[PDB]
Amino acid sequence: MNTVPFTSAPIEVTIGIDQYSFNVKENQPFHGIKDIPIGHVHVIHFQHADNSSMRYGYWFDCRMGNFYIQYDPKDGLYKMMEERDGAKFENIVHNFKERQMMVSYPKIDEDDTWYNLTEFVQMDKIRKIVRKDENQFSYVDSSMTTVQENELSDPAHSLNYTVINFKSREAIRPGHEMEDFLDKSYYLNTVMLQGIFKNSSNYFGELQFAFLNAMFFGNYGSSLQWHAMIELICSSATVPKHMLDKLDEILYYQIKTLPEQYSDILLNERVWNICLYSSFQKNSLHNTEKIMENKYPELL
Amino acid sequence: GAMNSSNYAELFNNDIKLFVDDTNVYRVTVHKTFEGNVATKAINGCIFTLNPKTGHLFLKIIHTSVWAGQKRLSQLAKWKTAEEVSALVRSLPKEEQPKQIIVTRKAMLDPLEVHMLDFPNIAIRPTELRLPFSAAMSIDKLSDVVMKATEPQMVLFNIYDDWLDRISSYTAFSRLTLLLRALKTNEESAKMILLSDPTITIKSYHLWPSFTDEQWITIESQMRDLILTEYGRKYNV
Numbered sequence A: 001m002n003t004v005p006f007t008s009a010p011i012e013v014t015i016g017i018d019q020y021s022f023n024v025k026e027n028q029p030f031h032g033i034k035d036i037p038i039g040h041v042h043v044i045h046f047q048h049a050d051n052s053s054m055r056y057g058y059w060f061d062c063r064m065g066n067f068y069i070q071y072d073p074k075d076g077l078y079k080m081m082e083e084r085d086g087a088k089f090e091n092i093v094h095n096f097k098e099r100q101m102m103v104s105y106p107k108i109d110e111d112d113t114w115y116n117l118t119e120f121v122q123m124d125k126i127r128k129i130v131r132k133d134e135n136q137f138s139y140v141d142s143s144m145t146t147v148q149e150n151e152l153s154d155p156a157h158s159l160n161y162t163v164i165n166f167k168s169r170e171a172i173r174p175g176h177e178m179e180d181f182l183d184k185s186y187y188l189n190t191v192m193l194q195g196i197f198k199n200s201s202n203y204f205g206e207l208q209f210a211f212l213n214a215m216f217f218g219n220y221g222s223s224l225q226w227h228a229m230i231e232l233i234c235s236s237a238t239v240p241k242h243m244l245d246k247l248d249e250i251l252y253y254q255i256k257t258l259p260e261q262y263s264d265i266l267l268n269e270r271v272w273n274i275c276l277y278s279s280f281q282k283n284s285l286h287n288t289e290k291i292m293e294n295k296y297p298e299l300l
Numbered sequence B: 001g002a003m004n005s006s007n008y009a010e011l012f013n014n015d016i017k018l019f020v021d022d023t024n025v026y027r028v029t030v031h032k033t034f035e036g037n038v039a040t041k042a043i044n045g046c047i048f049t050l051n052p053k054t055g056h057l058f059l060k061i062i063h064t065s066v067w068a069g070q071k072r073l074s075q076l077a078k079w080k081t082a083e084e085v086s087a088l089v090r091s092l093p094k095e096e097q098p099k100q101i102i103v104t105r106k107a108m109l110d111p112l113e114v115h116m117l118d119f120p121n122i123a124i125r126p127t128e129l130r131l132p133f134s135a136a137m138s139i140d141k142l143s144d145v146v147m148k149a150t151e152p153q154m155v156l157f158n159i160y161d162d163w164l165d166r167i168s169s170y171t172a173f174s175r176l177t178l179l180l181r182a183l184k185t186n187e188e189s190a191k192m193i194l195l196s197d198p199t200i201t202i203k204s205y206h207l208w209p210s211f212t213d214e215q216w217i218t219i220e221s222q223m224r225d226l227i228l229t230e231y232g233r234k235y236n237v
């Protein structure tokens, strides 16, 4: 169980850690988060009390180093940093636990929610989508745009998701125009799975990361990517049976986690109605269709 | 974007454009089977691809053999339309290729866009105009060449005959659309108007009769009367 200490909390902020959150008052004696489960990526995220604009945060994996948060009064945000001096870090942390100044990652033992949302998410892949190679952790905020959004402007601050475009030469074989547009299996299995992602695990990892970015930071460009990756599978007549079963589980837990008041903006009506009721895979997503129908029947 | 009454003179500027109408591509007769069920029999169709500035009509005849053994023919017809339009553009010299293609039905947008991916600088546009190009098969010579075809074939016409010698392309298109609107609203009466006088003939190399300027005003007036009327006989006004 690892720890992300905070130097201090000089500004009032709501702090998130994965799907949990808590309020820290201005100058409250808060010194970080302990008992973070090893073996998963994590995200620590913030919404300042004064300015609800710019939600931002950090993806990290405690196995990759000792990380801490420090408020920067010049740039005006809580910054993640790496502490290279291992003994300095352990000593700092032990002092803060002894004075009980840390919140405990509050995982219920029955609860697999976080695993189910990050099953295929790896730090190494996050770092290729979010390019900042000098750091082991990845910053994301609400405003960051994706590579594809920039094709339709600062490249250093972009989300380099895999570009998916259904009316593109990559997507459409010469001479198979109707075939490839109405049944995207070629684009899914050959172009994307075999060619670009290499396996379905990496595909699902990017899909899960896009969803999480979209939910936690309100990244519109991540939502775009999440829905595009769902739609590419549902619009394929030929999908490996194991991918379909796994997709149903992935989406089920994503829909389970979306709090009732945020789905009106997140759920793209067209994609979901097409996927659940018109597409080749309309009958292959039983768990996802049952939760969608009981939790969000208006959208449909 | 979409073509409408606000930007109607754009049709007659000097950027090459084509209208594509697919409403006569997949044509069927519906009939009863010996068992009392219903079946369709396809008949020959055509893509109506028209330069509105010059009158040049690229009439791609769709022979019924193109449907043999195929499923979902109404869907296929839109993609067949897009395949043939794309093939036509690729066959034209670069300086003859259109800068825009306007489809008369919005369901042609995605099929054409996909087939034209190699031509990213050709704009594919819908229109809000309810153009009467479906009536093209009421033009006897066009109907004749379509029904007689025994194989796929492209036939080139000028749908304005020699009008551009005397009138502008805006006026020629307006006359064309009035004639076609009349033929669509009441084909028999429209055709009666066009041919009542046996001394006005259709030249062998023309589609419409050889009307003088004055006779065209009478004719156009009779077509507007017909269209007006039918709109009464239809809505009782």
Ligand SMILES: CCOC(=O)c1csc(NC2CC2)n1
Residues within 6 Å of the ligand: A214, A215, A216, A217, A218, A219, A220, A221, A223, A258, A259, A262, A263, A265, A266
């Ligand atoms: C857990 C709370 O959910 C949100 O905060 C939320 C979900 S999608 C979103 N915003 C989309 C970019 C448009 N904001």
